[PDB]
A paper describes a structure:
Polycomb repressive complex 2 ([name]) trimethylates histone H3 on K27 (H3K27me3) leading to gene silencing that is essential for embryonic development and maintenance of cell identity. A central mechanism of [name] activation is the recognition of [name]-trimethylated lysine peptides by its EED subunit, resulting in conformational changes within [name] that lead to the allosteric activation of the complex. We discovered that [name]-containing and H3K36me3-containing nucleosomes inhibit [name] using two distinct mechanisms because of the differences in their positions along the histone H3 tail.
Overall, this complex resembles other [name]–nucleosome structures, in which the H3 tail is clearly visible entering the active site and H3K27 is positioned for catalysis. Unlike the interactions with H3K36me3-modified nucleosomes, we were unable to identify a population of particles lacking tail engagement. However, we do observe a methylated lysine bound to the aromatic cage of EED. We propose that this density corresponds to the [name] modification, the only source of methylated peptide in the sample. Although the affinity of EED for the [name] peptide was previously reported to be low, it is important to notice that our structure reports the interaction of [name] with EED in the context of the nucleosome, the relevant [name] substrate. In our structure of [name] bound to [name]-modified nucleosomes, we see that [name] can engage with the EED aromatic cage and occupy the allosteric site of EED. In conclusion, our structural analysis leads us to propose that the abundance of [name] localized on actively transcribed chromatin acts as allosteric antagonist to decrease [name] activity at these genomic locations.
Residue numbers in the entry:
A (entry chain J): 20 to 102
B (entry chain R), G (entry chain K): 12 to 119
C (entry chain S): 27 to 122
D (entry chain I): 36 to 135
E (entry chain O): 37 to 135
F (entry chain Q): 16 to 102
H (entry chain M): 28 to 122
DNA sequence: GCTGCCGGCGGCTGGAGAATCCCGGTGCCGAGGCCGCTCAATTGGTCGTAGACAGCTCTAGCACCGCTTAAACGCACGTACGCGCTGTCCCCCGCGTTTAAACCGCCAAGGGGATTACTCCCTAGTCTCCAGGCACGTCTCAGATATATACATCCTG
DNA sequence: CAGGATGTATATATCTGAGACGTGCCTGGAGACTAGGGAGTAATCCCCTTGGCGGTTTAAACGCGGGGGACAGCGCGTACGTGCGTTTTAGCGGTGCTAGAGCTGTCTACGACCAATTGAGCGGCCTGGGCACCGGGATTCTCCAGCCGCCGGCAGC
């Protein structure tokens, strides 16, 4: 059993723990796919900008400074990696 | 003659000269004043001092000596005006404030 | 052994040493504090540069930073921040 | 004798208490890193990610999803429910100004 | 004897009439007085040009139309047609305005 | 009798029909009777937030009049960019 | 002699020279390159051309020749990729787009 | 005296270039002028921050190109980059 | 009437897992002395943004009556709201298990990064003349009235 | 369950006229003709941290089974929002009329700028010793289901 998509790697218990930190009590069984969709969309929206920043800097490595920049651009500032 | 730093004359521990030079290379304006670096350094020092005091309060409330990002996030979210200042900022290794809606709680 | 960088390490540590003399700060929290200082500095400086270019001026003085602080920091932070900014500017001007 | 089993929806509260107090991430590092690398493989081929960049992206997305789930909880409770449903997430995002 | 219109149908005609048009829905003198009174405690002896009152009026109407769109979304989500202050509060809370 | 004619109870000038029209443009059929005060409070806090920035802009400019340039500046500052006024 | 303007040589109907001067005097960077104003003016001209053609289509549908802010809102919001650009902006006398939830309609 | 600048002439030429028999109102002209001024500043500030990010003291067509990619969503992005490249290559072809 | 009887009622008690505390041992590593360099502070002089004064002057605010139409008041009325009962069937929650994350060790190497010679592109200095801005000045063709028909309702049989 | 009468909307012929669009006039700012000198740019080497590999091992994800409780739906009370007739009240306006703040032009002056010297703030690099961490066991912390005395109906008379 080795053939698996990396989108499914966001396991159902991981979503459950994330929602527990969010503060929810009972979760419907169709949350576990909508949350994957939201996660994928959010990851594209940030890694697209991260990729663009790396291309502009003529680098091939996606820097943590770059991810911070793309996040602050998106309206979600990150603390812990420079600034 | 003998020289001395700017912050000694301005009564600060936040770098007036560094802020001046940062405003200078930051392309913000063609010219910057001599008191604007000092005012900005004072505002930065005030905000940092208040944040650090609030975070140290939580750290000592957890019977710890060294400030941790969890305590600092607690201090940021637990003061309404600072939460407003840092509303769209997310703190890595900060977690979330413990808050449970009263509906989810049991009947008794 | 080369390419030294710059940060607000000593300044934030010194601010801690005057407010909680027996409390230290971890590395991750300290880097987060550094990012906070950089973010707020860029915010206020951007607002003040906006004001300076925005009233057809070219010099950023304590009035621009004052209006940016009154314009960014909400509520009581604005009052204490402007109060300490003016006291710092007057302390600078008094002793040459 | 008889066995001990908790009242359904109490360990949910216990996990809410534990995770709202904890600090570490709630998604395994390797699968999330694989997802990030796969989803950047479309934008550019042969991309390298710093060790810190991946975890920056990680806890950024974890905070995003925690905030979304909190808003979803509020929306569901506003709908006089306890179960969070896909339509709750859709409404939370739409009001937040994300889906539309 | 006389013809009477069912409730909600006139509200629907009015929903279609006020959405197609773009003319301003808050009277100018009451809003100008509101703006001047709100600006009193900020700085006394202030002068407001009709262009600034224009801008404030348009901004406020746009903001309130957006808030009522979100509030209608909340009310329909909760299987209601009527909008209540709880919907307005939830729309404001998810937006992050009152958070 | 030259100036300083302070008025009061003018937030009631945002009448119930005005809020109903604004709602119907927003897209609602049925209306509560108790949402009018909440909506008036919401408008008051929004206007206070915008007007604070508008007034502090003028005070920085050392002017005694508030322009639509100033209102637009304040609106764009808080993330509510407004077009049609010399932006 | 034989003075010739920049917009003509660049094949642009937008002020490349004015954009260059405004970048120079806008405190964006210490120095501004030569192709940057051309690229920026081209992008601005494309964006305004797209919005203007959509607004003209809206006006022609409305059986109207001139363009009013209502048509500009109608063109901006009806196109999703423009709406994403102008999501956090509002235009004076723009109105909104007529839409009603299917819940609000009667049975038949 | 006291001349003021705007984008009215260029927006009018753009209109005549897409609809040579369709006019504009005075309010929509200010609306378009404000949109142009807003997008111009939005792209220029992003390019400035891009240059500051890499310790570059210059703004070039590459910085504005990257800013266009960041700002304009998708189809807008790959049309706008193409048009900017076309205009810059026509500019550099004949100096 | 009044005996039994029958089901609930909540009040309480201890067995049940969870959580916490502290002693005991253990590292790991934030906080401190050292070197020197690199840049920040000092003179010395400039020259040019920005303050003042002096006007002009358009313009925001006040009053004042006539209109009229929207705002406020009432009044049947039926429709949405809220609640209560019900019947599920579908989330939770332990248990066995199957496994895949996580560490730990050793390498090769593409990629990031500091120096160097340089060259050649954006800046700086003047002249010039044409494109943008504005005061008109129109005659418009863009708009707004009042008219006349089709329409979508809500009742009847 | 199909027609008829109705308050709504639709088109359309004049009015009818504020104002987008030339038309010049003017002017100021962008382009054309000269160095120039530092900002980026290949070329080079020099690390480095990154991705890859292969044993354990071990907690976590997973599939199954039971349950009960949250949820959706249907019937019922109800009262409040809604649509419409009746004042009435204040926006809207159009008339002048008033000074007030905006706005521009000049002289001046002082403070931000910048260059050559010189000293120390601090960023780094070890380093000894000090705080966060883990173990097991004793100590509590809640949480749940059965025993029981009490209570209120329930068949008879």
């Amino acid at each position: 059993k080795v053939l698996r998509d990396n989108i499914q790697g966001i396991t159902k218990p991981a979503i459950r723990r994330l929602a527990r930190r969010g503060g929810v009590k009972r979760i419907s069984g169709l949350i576990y796919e909508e949350t994957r969709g939201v996660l994928k969309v959010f990851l594209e929206n940030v890694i697209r900008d991260a990729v663009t920043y790396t291309e502009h800097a003529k680098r091939k490595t996606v820097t943590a400074m770059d991810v911070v920049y793309a996040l602050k651009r998106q309206g979600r500032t990150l603390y812990g990696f420079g600034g | 003659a003998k020289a001395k730093t700017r912050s000694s004359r301005a009564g600060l521990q936040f770098p007036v000269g560094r802020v001046h030079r940062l405003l200078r290379k930051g392309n913000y304006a063609e010219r910057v004043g001599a008191g604007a670096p000092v005012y900005l350094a004072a505002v930065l020092e005030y905000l940092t001092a208040e944040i650090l005091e609030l975070a140290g309060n939580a750290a000592r409330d957890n019977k710890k000596t060294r400030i941790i990002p969890r305590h600092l996030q607690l201090a940021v979210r637990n003061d309404e005006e600072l939460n407003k200042l840092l509303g769209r900022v997310t703190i890595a290794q900060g977690g979330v404030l413990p808050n449970i809606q009263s509906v989810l709680l049991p009947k008794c | 052994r080369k390419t030294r960088k710059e940060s607000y390490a000593i300044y934030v540590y010194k601010v801690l040493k005057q407010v909680h003399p027996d409390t230290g700060i971890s590395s991750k929290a300290m880097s987060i504090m550094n990012s906070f200082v950089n973010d707020v500095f860029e915010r206020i400086a951007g607002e003040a540069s906006r004001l300076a270019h925005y009233n057809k001026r070219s010099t950023i003085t304590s009035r621009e930073i004052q209006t940016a602080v009154r314009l960014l920091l909400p509520g009581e932070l604005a009052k204490h921040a402007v109060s300490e900014g003016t006291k710092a500017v007057t302390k600078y001007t008094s002793a040459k | 004798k008889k066995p001990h089993r908790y009242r359904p929806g109490t360990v949910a509260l216990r996990e809410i208490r534990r995770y709202q107090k904890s600090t570490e991430l709630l998604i395994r590092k390797l699968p999330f890193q694989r997802l990030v690398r796969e989803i950047a493989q479309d934008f550019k081929t042969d991309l390298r990610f710093q060790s810190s960049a991946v975890m920056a992206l990680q806890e950024a997305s974890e905070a995003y999803l925690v905030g979304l789930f909190e808003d979803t909880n509020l929306c569901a409770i506003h709908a006089k429910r306890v179960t969070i449903m896909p339509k709750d997430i859709q409404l939370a995002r739409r009001i937040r100004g994300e889906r539309a």
